[PDB]
Please model this.
Amino acid sequence: STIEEQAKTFLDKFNHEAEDLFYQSSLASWNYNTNITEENVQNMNNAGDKWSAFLKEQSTLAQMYPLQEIQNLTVKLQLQALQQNGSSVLSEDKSKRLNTILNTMSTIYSTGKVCNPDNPQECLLLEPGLNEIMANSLDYNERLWAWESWRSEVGKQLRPLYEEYVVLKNEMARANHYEDYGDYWRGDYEVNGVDGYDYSRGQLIEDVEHTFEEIKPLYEHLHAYVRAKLMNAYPSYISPIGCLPAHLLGDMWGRFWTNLYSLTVPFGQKPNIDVTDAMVDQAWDAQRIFKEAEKFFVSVGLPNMTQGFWENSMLTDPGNVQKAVCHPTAWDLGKGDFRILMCTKVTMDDFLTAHHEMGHIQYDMAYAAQPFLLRNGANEGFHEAVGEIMSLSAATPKHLKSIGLLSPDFQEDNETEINFLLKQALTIVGTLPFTYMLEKWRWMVFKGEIPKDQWMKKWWEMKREIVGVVEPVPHDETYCDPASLFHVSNDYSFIRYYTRTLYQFQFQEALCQAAKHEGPLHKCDISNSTEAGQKLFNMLRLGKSEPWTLALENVVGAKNMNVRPLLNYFEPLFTWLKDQNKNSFVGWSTDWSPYA
Amino acid sequence: PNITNLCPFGEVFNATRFASVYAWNRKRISNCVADYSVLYNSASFSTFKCYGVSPTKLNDLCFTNVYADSFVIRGDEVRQIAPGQTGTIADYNYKLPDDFTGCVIAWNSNNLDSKVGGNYNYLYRLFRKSNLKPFERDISTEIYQAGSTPCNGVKGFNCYFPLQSYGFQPTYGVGYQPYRVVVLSFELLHAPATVCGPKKS
Ligand SMILES: *[C@@H]1O[C@H](CO)[C@@H](O)[C@H](O)[C@H]1NC(C)=O
Ligand SMILES: *[C@@H]1O[C@H](CO)[C@@H](O)[C@H](O)[C@H]1NC(C)=O
Ligand SMILES: *[C@@H]1O[C@H](CO)[C@@H](O)[C@H](O)[C@H]1NC(C)=O
Ligand SMILES: *[C@@H]1O[C@H](CO)[C@@H](O)[C@H](O)[C@H]1NC(C)=O
Ligand SMILES: *[C@@H]1O[C@H](CO)[C@@H](O)[C@H](O)[C@H]1NC(C)=O
Ligand SMILES: *[C@@H]1O[C@H](CO)[C@@H](O)[C@H](O)[C@H]1NC(C)=O
Ligand SMILES: *[C@@H]1O[C@H](CO)[C@@H](O)[C@H](O)[C@H]1NC(C)=O
Model:
């Protein structure tokens, strides 16, 4: 009769038909990932085409139910999610051109091979050929050669492609009643219709700037300390008053600073918290790693893994004859089927990764009661943040002593906590200005603030101003230096990492306050606390049914993303860095003082 | 006296194929001896919830007729086979009365009713104009009219096909795996009661 009942029947047939088509697509993707064979590729492509065609037909059919005659918030949320045109609003020729451009960028990034001129007999791919050189070399000209050669080849190939990409994506977004493609990406955090908990697309940029303004002193002190240590490592290249050279940050792009922990360690003489040898001595299998992770999740009060999880997951590398993707991935296939695909080794990194991916699985299991189109995180930040909090809690020395992996007579003094916090800062704090600068640059490119002839002149100007990283030699407009990264070249949003980083420590403070931890925030473990797990599971069970602001109210009691838990987490390190930077100069100059 | 002529519980529980929830099979059991302790002491059943009578005194009481209703549902839908419940199965597929005397027996059948490609032989009604009355069967395959516009037999806009299939696959979760359900309905009517338990010597 009424429009709302019609929409509810439509979203009762949709949920059932889509759960079946999804499960089939996901199972085909799983069979491709655990078994790389050409028939599995064909089956994956067939299932993906059926899934995409079905989503196109239901999007075509969902728009015929007008939004303003529906009052139920959940029904309106599912219909809003379904009624997005995506690329369908664009013409078929331009849509085909956009798809071709995306595929060719994927092939250029994946199969991009660069080696030294005059020695072309063998060449190295990005993974692991260039990654190992960037992460382990101490030679200035070798890192300079690898960095400049990879940005020369990849940027000179991708620059016309990206120029076409920005125009096509802007055309699609303005065809979809958005200001630009940046507004389309910011629409994931848009909340409309809820009194008090409304969030706007324009509020996201202001909140990101407001949080980064508080990030900036800690990053300035960390930057000064890393600059002094890199000056010790490389005597003449780094200036006391200038920015850091781009190719010396330990990674290909500057995404993480975690590969500089060896050079910038505060107390080398003190031991590390490496527990790899202890698991080797006790013969810990990957099954034992996942059972310990499951023990951690049952300790906090969350449900334990299903029998189908243990039966159907691949937690060890299959062998030489059968090929599989080595990247750890948690799969929510649908219909209560949860799996983890990880080539688990006996390392601390794999153990923490097991905790992280089982956190992803717990998040997926929690919203299984929700309707199919609402089975996601409230925003893109929460899904990664709930895994990163498990990675935070599992890495604590209290957790390692509790599970027996660390000796009970290990002395936890201030120096080990300082160096551990510095390692966590290099991984976590160092990615924040790079993430913010990259997303702000992409937003300005999509908005049209920066003309195409001035993309790089502004970009390096942004990098000096925000990241404090200077180019080794000037680049003209024939280069495409941003698109050398995986996320930007393959049409992925990048603000999820910034939001994930802030939500991680907000959730950590909320659960540690719930668990009544009485010490430093980085010394906090959320095991054995039923109330902390209940506070987490209240948000976890909602999924995408409720606004992310209301979910954040459910956990931390705040209606907005906040930066104070992160600064509270790194406060011992912040005081130590302020003490250590008395002689040195905090802050940088945007001039060409180190090298240009 | 000497007891023989047992009731055909082998052709209900150990049947090679079960019916769908919508066209649920009803077998009337009369004039035999029903040994319920063989059912109760089995370890193969996950649900043996009896409403209105207790399993211990089933073996003593005597009934006029026994209705054995058999079908296959999901794991999460077993809870809806009870008096006073709600859900797709109770509203549109199989409805139990509030004043129900009998037992609901359910067990997991992932071994038999799930295939790797997907078993689409089992179907459920997802749409009907009104809720079902107790012990009603609807096997109509008429197109559901959700809108004012007439369907005219074609599955176009706002007009859906009522019966949907459960794609039972072995790798499913325990709440989505196939469960065979046998509901025994016991009524005592003014006719001579002939379905009695075994009498001790
Ligand atoms: C992987 O694919 C090969 C291809 O023939 C097949 O023989 C093998 O059984 C498959 N293994 C698994 C675990 O699926
Ligand atoms: C919205 O619809 C769901 C089912 O689709 C229903 O359970 C819920 O109560 C409805 N909410 C409101 C406020 O009507
Ligand atoms: C999707 O596209 C169709 C036609 O291209 C248009 O009528 C409809 O309004 C679009 N939907 C949205 C949400 O913009
Ligand atoms: C999960 O926990 C329940 C109750 O603690 C237990 O019965 C069940 O066997 C556990 N699941 C697994 C796979 O061990
Ligand atoms: C660590 O604690 C000792 C004892 O209180 C103190 O002497 C030392 O200066 C402290 N170091 C730092 C970096 O706080
Ligand atoms: C958490 O509970 C387990 C179960 O007894 C216990 O062995 C462990 O020591 C507890 N953790 C802490 C930190 O007390
Ligand atoms: C059904 O099959 C089981 C399994 O072999 C058997 O033990 C039982 O006697 C059979 N009959 C009944 C009525 O349960």
About this structure: Residues A 8, 72, 74-75 surround 2-acetamido-2-deoxy-beta-D-glucopyranose (ligand 2) (CB under 6 Å).
